[PDB]
Amino acid sequence: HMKIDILDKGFVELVDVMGNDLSAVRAARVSFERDRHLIEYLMKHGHETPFEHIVFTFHVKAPIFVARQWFRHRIASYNELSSYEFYIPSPERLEGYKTTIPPERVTEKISEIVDKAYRTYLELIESGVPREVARIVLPLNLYTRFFWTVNARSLMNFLNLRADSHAQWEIQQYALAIARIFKEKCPWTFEAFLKYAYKGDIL
Amino acid sequence: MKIDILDKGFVELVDVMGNDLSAVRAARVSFEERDRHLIEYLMKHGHETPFEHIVFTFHVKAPIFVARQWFRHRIASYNELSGRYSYEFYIPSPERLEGYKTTIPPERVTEKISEIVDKAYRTYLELIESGVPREVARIVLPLNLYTRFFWTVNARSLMNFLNLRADSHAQWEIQQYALAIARIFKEKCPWTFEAFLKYAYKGDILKEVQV
Amino acid sequence: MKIDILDKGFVELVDVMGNDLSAVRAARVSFDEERDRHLIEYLMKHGHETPFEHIVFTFHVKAPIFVARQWFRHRIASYNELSGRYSKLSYEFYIPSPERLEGYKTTIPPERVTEKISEIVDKAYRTYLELIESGVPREVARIVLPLNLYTRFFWTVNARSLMNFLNLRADSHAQWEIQQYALAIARIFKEKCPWTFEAFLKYAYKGDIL
Amino acid sequence: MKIDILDKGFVELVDVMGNDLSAVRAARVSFDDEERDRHLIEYLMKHGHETPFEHIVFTFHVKAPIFVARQWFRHRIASYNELSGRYLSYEFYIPSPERLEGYKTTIPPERVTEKISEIVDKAYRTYLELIESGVPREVARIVLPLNLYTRFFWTVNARSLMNFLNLRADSHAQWEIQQYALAIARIFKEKCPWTFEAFLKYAYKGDILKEVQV
Ligand SMILES: Cc1cc2nc3c(=O)[nH]c(=O)nc-3n(C[C@H](O)[C@H](O)[C@H](O)COP(=O)(O)OP(=O)(O)OC[C@H]3O[C@@H](n4cnc5c(N)ncnc54)[C@H](O)[C@@H]3O)c2cc1C
Ligand SMILES: Cc1cc2nc3c(=O)[nH]c(=O)nc-3n(C[C@H](O)[C@H](O)[C@H](O)COP(=O)(O)OP(=O)(O)OC[C@H]3O[C@@H](n4cnc5c(N)ncnc54)[C@H](O)[C@@H]3O)c2cc1C
Ligand SMILES: Cc1cc2nc3c(=O)[nH]c(=O)nc-3n(C[C@H](O)[C@H](O)[C@H](O)COP(=O)(O)OP(=O)(O)OC[C@H]3O[C@@H](n4cnc5c(N)ncnc54)[C@H](O)[C@@H]3O)c2cc1C
Ligand SMILES: Cc1cc2nc3c(=O)[nH]c(=O)nc-3n(C[C@H](O)[C@H](O)[C@H](O)COP(=O)(O)OP(=O)(O)OC[C@H]3O[C@@H](n4cnc5c(N)ncnc54)[C@H](O)[C@@H]3O)c2cc1C
């Protein structure tokens, strides 16, 4: 039932979990500590199929540009909603970058066009324009929500790619919440993953 | 839940994530008779994705010729006993040969299958007793040798499996496994199952064979 | 073989592996024209579609992001979208034509709806350049751009998955924009695999517009 | 392009879509410089950006013993079409003495060969008998040994193919499938030389392909 807030209005919420570290042990042996030893053994040599028997269901609220990257992970199940909020980058988001415009003003200019686009959308809607058409004016930082069911193996591949300094900061934050939850429900698998398979650097 | 299939096989439910409501939750993307109304609506309109949020893990013991057919379903996860490092055989019953006129009595056919299986197995043990590695010695064992595997699959894929295996076109032996699979599916997801039969099931036996 | 879609989009055939006979060869597992078409119709009629997985296409698509998001929901395929790390990035947007709004009674004339969409696109785009020039990283600045921004991708999919794509997108219930791309996809598919395409429409196509 | 494997098997190239440049065009998303293209292939492989290689596809026709096919069919990201056993041509894999020539046995390597050959013969005969008798082939075939040869068409993209080689072109895999993987590698090397060399240099996890040639 975990829920972690991300960005200004987003979140990653655990909906359900099937199995735990032992589910992988049971699959590896096809049965029902030497177990903690098996998990590391499987992880080191790359015998990842057993980890497919651990599944998670997440409910995610994220901006569309983050969701688009996320949806690139094909080995998972998705259900997106089909209620108007936008991700406004905080000023600290620009730290490290020397901008002509003070960080606060960048955050302002972003709020402004967002507000203008949204008002235009509302206007078109109020005039009878089909929502599917009017919505194309909305910006990429609009929040959407979706359910994500993914097994532990696919999830680790997701973390290898998004829990990395080379990934956009925003997606990293989401990947951090995903890892946090994965760690809570599968300590052994996660630790093992971190010790032998994790390719990123932020975890 | 363990259901015996054939002479020594079985389908045993290991774990399950969610139920009919999981698909309802997924469909609405949030947290009585209207939920069941939703399941039906999704099924009759081809909105299958919500059902991917229901997942099962089965433990199956079946003859290799049946497993081979089963493993053809790629949208699932499998873990089977290693033929290399990890001995019962399926002997059809005389009744299995009912309907086909044979030159010899059904029990004769049954006896003969039992005969070769016995010879193959005896030869196998002989090879092993001789120092022959199992990965090599096992190649003489027949296709009716029983094997075991864990199968994790979501409800949408499980329904595709039923469309194909719980049908008269599939070999009788796997139909039997498909019936047990359907039996378990129905008990864990009654609304989805009824909706499935009513609007999307393409097979024939599940609409004739109770549960 | 290229087809223009919307105002600045397109679907272009990049490569294709096999033809109708590739599904025949796979079905028979090996290696008379009417005997071959009969097998193809036979496979399609009984839902034996795996043989059609041995026909593959690679398309180059230029579409608005909102169309792309729906398209990318088809997981049994391969995609590579433009990033800017290997190729230059261009900025164009889908501006609906007044006709797109027919059948709908609007308080604002169609031409005025088109005008308003162009307006936001212009302002969103300029705010974007404003941010870039100010030293704001593109990854951050681009978040103000609208969903009608055109993007490009390569799409490799086999004929079976392709037919699933047409069943869902070449249909009146799918958004009009994606329908236009689906029609174009169907067309190239027909040109390269007429027997398979014919059979698809006769026994398996679930949609309506084709 | 056909290569014999084991005593009666083979791997045959049926078709192929694209080449090394298919990955380059996909990574650049452009459908319009050997030095630079080769550099990009290596860059992609070195940094794990593997999706571009999914736009290179192969179709093979394979003949292998069922015990080998069962291992092969475990690779799910691919397309398979196998001969229907439920609905001619029965051959079996008989290990040569050199196969066991490395393990201490209590009988001559040649005896194992004869032993295996015997049962295969006995099982095959019983099967033919049952068939003649009127027993459906889907039922009579269950007495056939796992070394029976089957055939299938295999369509797989370059990315998935490399995962297959990682796992099967390795000393940890059974010797028999190792032989097939070597043949697969040979064909792969011939059609996509750059991707293959890049594969071996930055991503290949097995042993044999860096030891054996082509
Ligand atoms: C009566 C009967 C006779 C049969 N005869 C033969 C035979 O002669 N030869 C033979 O080889 N097999 C035969 N089969 C096996 C048949 O090919 C299987 O149904 C198939 O291998 C597994 O089914 P699937 O594709 O529906 O399932 P899955 O592999 O689980 O896939 C589920 C869904 O995902 C899809 N999908 C998955 N991967 C891909 C992909 N790579 N490309 C496109 N779509 C994909 C499709 O939409 C599919 O319906 C037979 C089966 C039956 C029941
Ligand atoms: C009018 C309309 C409304 C829509 N509304 C919504 C909405 O509210 N929410 C939403 O999320 N989407 C919505 N969609 C998108 C729709 O769900 C897409 O068609 C779908 O996400 C992509 O199709 P697919 O699963 O058939 O294809 P693919 O992902 O390419 O899969 C092909 C086949 O393989 C299968 N398959 C693949 N992966 C799996 C898996 N992991 N488990 C089980 N089976 C699998 C199935 O048999 C499938 O048909 C809508 C589309 C339309 C036209
Ligand atoms: C810094 C960075 C830059 C990026 N740049 C680009 C870019 O320029 N263009 C772009 O398009 N994307 C880009 N991406 C997104 C990247 O391509 C995604 O990681 C990918 O689309 C989804 O990952 P996946 O294939 O590993 O995962 P999934 O799709 O979930 O697949 C999991 C595993 O299954 C596999 N697999 C699944 N389907 C197939 C298939 N059909 N064929 C073969 N193997 C398969 C592989 O073994 C894979 O690792 C970038 C990402 C990052 C972090
Ligand atoms: C030496 C050796 C020993 C073996 N021992 C055993 C054993 O004891 N027991 C046994 O059962 N098998 C065993 N196998 C078979 C092994 O499980 C296979 O490698 C596997 O079934 C097929 O590999 P794959 O997952 O890498 O490939 P594919 O199925 O082709 O998948 C390709 C890539 O896509 C992925 N992927 C595809 N589908 C999913 C999914 N549903 N969820 C998550 N990720 C997915 C991963 O990123 C994957 O690497 C062994 C193999 C070898 C070589």
What is the 8-class DSSP label of residue D55? G
Question: Ligand 4 atom closest to Cα of D173?
Answer: 1
| Element containing residue C13 per DSSP (H, E) | strand C9-17
Query: CA A87, CA A64: separation in Å to the nearest integer?
Result: 10
Q: Is it true that domain C2-210 has CATH number 3.30.1360.170?
A: yes
Answer whether A79 sits within 8 Å of B15, measured CB to CB: no
3-state class of B64 per DSSP? helix
Tokens representing C57 are 């296409």
Tokens representing D82 are 């196998």
Q: Is A55 in the pocket of ligand 4 (CB under 6 A)?
A: no
| Element containing residue D84 per DSSP (H, E) | none
* 3-class SS string, A30-50: CCCCHHHHHHHHHHHHCCCHH
Q: Is D159 in the pocket of ligand 3 (CB under 6 A)?
A: yes
Which residues in chain B have Cβ-Cβ distances shorter than 8 Å to D102?
A: none
The residue written with tokens 């098997």 in the block is D9
Paired with C16 in beta bridges are C57
Q: Is B145 within 8 Å of B63 (Cβ atoms)?
A: yes
Give the number of other Cβ atoms within 10 Å of residue C102's Cβ.
8
Query: CA C50, CA C164: separation in Å to the nearest integer?
Result: 13
Residue in B48, B75, B177 to alter for ligand 1 test, most ligand atoms within 8 A of Cβ: B75
Give the number of other Cβ atoms within 10 Å of residue A41's Cβ.
14
Query: CA A146, CA B26: separation in Å to the nearest integer?
Result: 8
Paired with C64 in beta bridges are C150
Answer whether C58 sits within 8 Å of D59, measured CB to CB: no
Q: Is D79 within 8 Å of D155 (Cβ atoms)?
A: yes
Answer whether B130 sits within 8 Å of D85, measured CB to CB: no
Q: How many CA atoms lie within 13 A of C148 on its CB side?
A: 27
Determine phi and psi for D82, rounding to 5 degrees.
-105, 155
The residue written with tokens 């809570």 in the block is A184
Which residues in chain A have Cβ-Cβ distances shorter than 8 Å to B86?
A: 30
Q: Is A117 within 8 Å of A105 (Cβ atoms)?
A: no
Answer whether D15 sits within 8 Å of C16, measured CB to CB: no
Cα distances from C185 to residues A55, C57, C169, C196, C199, in angstroms, run 35, 10, 10, 14, 16
The torsion defined by the Cα of D162, D166, D169 and D175, in degrees rounded to 10, comes to -130
Chains in contact with A via at least 3 Cβ–Cβ pairs below 8 Å? B, C
Interacting residues of A31 by C-beta distance below 8 A, sequence separation 6+ = none
For the four alpha carbons of D207, D186, A199 and A195, in that order, the dihedral sign comes to: negative
3-state class of C170 per DSSP? coil
Count helices and strands in chain B by DSSP H and E runs: 8, 5
Position A169, amino acid: W
Residue in B160, B163, B171, B174 to alter for ligand 1 test, most ligand atoms within 8 A of Cβ: B160
Determine phi and psi for B73, rounding to 5 degrees.
-80, 100
C-alpha C179: how far from chain center: 8
Q: How far is B203 from chain C (nearest CA, A)?
A: 11
Q: Is D71 within 8 Å of D174 (Cβ atoms)?
A: yes
Query: CA C50, CA A127: separation in Å to the nearest integer?
Result: 48
Q: Is A101 within 8 Å of C134 (Cβ atoms)?
A: yes
Tokens representing B51 are 């059902």
| Element containing residue C127 per DSSP (H, E) | helix C110-133
Q: Is B13 within 8 Å of B184 (Cβ atoms)?
A: yes
Give the number of other Cβ atoms within 10 Å of residue A200's Cβ.
18
Q: Which of B80, B89, B88 is nearest to B149 (CA)?
A: B80
Tokens representing D62 are 């394979």
Topology of the domain comprising D2-214: Gyrase A; domain 2 (3.30.1360)
Q: How many CA atoms lie within 13 A of C125 on its CB side?
A: 14
Give the number of other Cβ atoms within 10 Å of residue B75's Cβ.
16
Query: CA D164, CA D77: separation in Å to the nearest integer?
Result: 10
Query: CA A112, CA B110: separation in Å to the nearest integer?
Result: 81
Q: Is D157 in the pocket of ligand 3 (CB under 6 A)?
A: yes
Say if residue B71 carries a ligand binding annotation: yes
Chains in contact with B via at least 3 Cβ–Cβ pairs below 8 Å? A, C, D
List the single best residue of A3, A12, A18 to mutate versus B (max B Cβ within 10 A). Answer: A18
- What separation, in Å, do the N-terminal and C-terminal C-alpha atoms of chain C show? 20
What DSSP line would sit under chain A, residue for residue? --EEEETTTEEEEEEEEE--HHHHHHHHHT---HHHHHHHHHHHHT--GGGGG-EEEEEEEEEHHHHHHHTT--SSEEEE-----B----GGGGTT---SS-HHHHHHHHHHHHHHHHHHHHHHHHTT--HHHHGGGSBTTBEEEEEEEEEHHHHHHHHHHHSSTTS-HHHHHHHHHHHHHHHHH-HHHHHHIIIII---S--
Q: Is it true that domain A1-203 has CATH number 3.30.1360.170?
A: yes
Position B120, amino acid: A
Residue in A160, A161, A178, A199 to alter for ligand 3 test, most ligand atoms within 8 A of Cβ: A161
Q: Which of D100, D116, D118, D120 is nearest to D108 (CA)?
A: D100
Active site residues of B: 165
Q: Which of A171, A137, A80 is nearest to C73 (CA)?
A: A80
Burial A133-143 (b: 16+ CB within 10 A, else e): bbbbbbbbbbb
For A103, the closest chain C residue by CA position comes to: C136
Q: Is D63 in the pocket of ligand 3 (CB under 6 A)?
A: no
Q: How far is B128 from chain D (nearest CA, A)?
A: 9
Query: CA B126, CA B137: separation in Å to the nearest integer?
Result: 9
What DSSP line would sit under C44-102, residue for residue? HHTT--GGGGG-EEEEEEEEEHHHHHHHTT--SSEEEE--SSSS-----B----GGGGT
3-state class of C157 per DSSP? strand
Tokens representing B192 are 């989805």
Q: What is the CATH number of domain B2-211?
A: 3.30.1360.170
Query: CA B53, CA C50: separation in Å to the nearest integer?
Result: 25
Alpha carbon of D111 to ligand 3 centroid (Å): 51
Alpha carbon of C58 to ligand 2 centroid (Å): 21
C-alpha D11: how far from chain center: 7
Which residues in chain B have Cβ-Cβ distances shorter than 8 Å to D122?
A: 116, 119
Q: Which of C38, C46, C40 is nearest to C26 (CA)?
A: C40
Determine phi and psi for C61, rounding to 5 degrees.
-115, 140
Cα distances from C41 to residues C163, D59, D80, D81, D87, in angstroms, run 14, 22, 20, 18, 19
Q: Is D173 within 8 Å of D70 (Cβ atoms)?
A: no
Tokens representing C205 are 């196509």
Q: Which residues of D are annotated as a binding site for dUMP?
A: 71-74, 82-86, 141, 168
3-state class of D121 per DSSP? helix
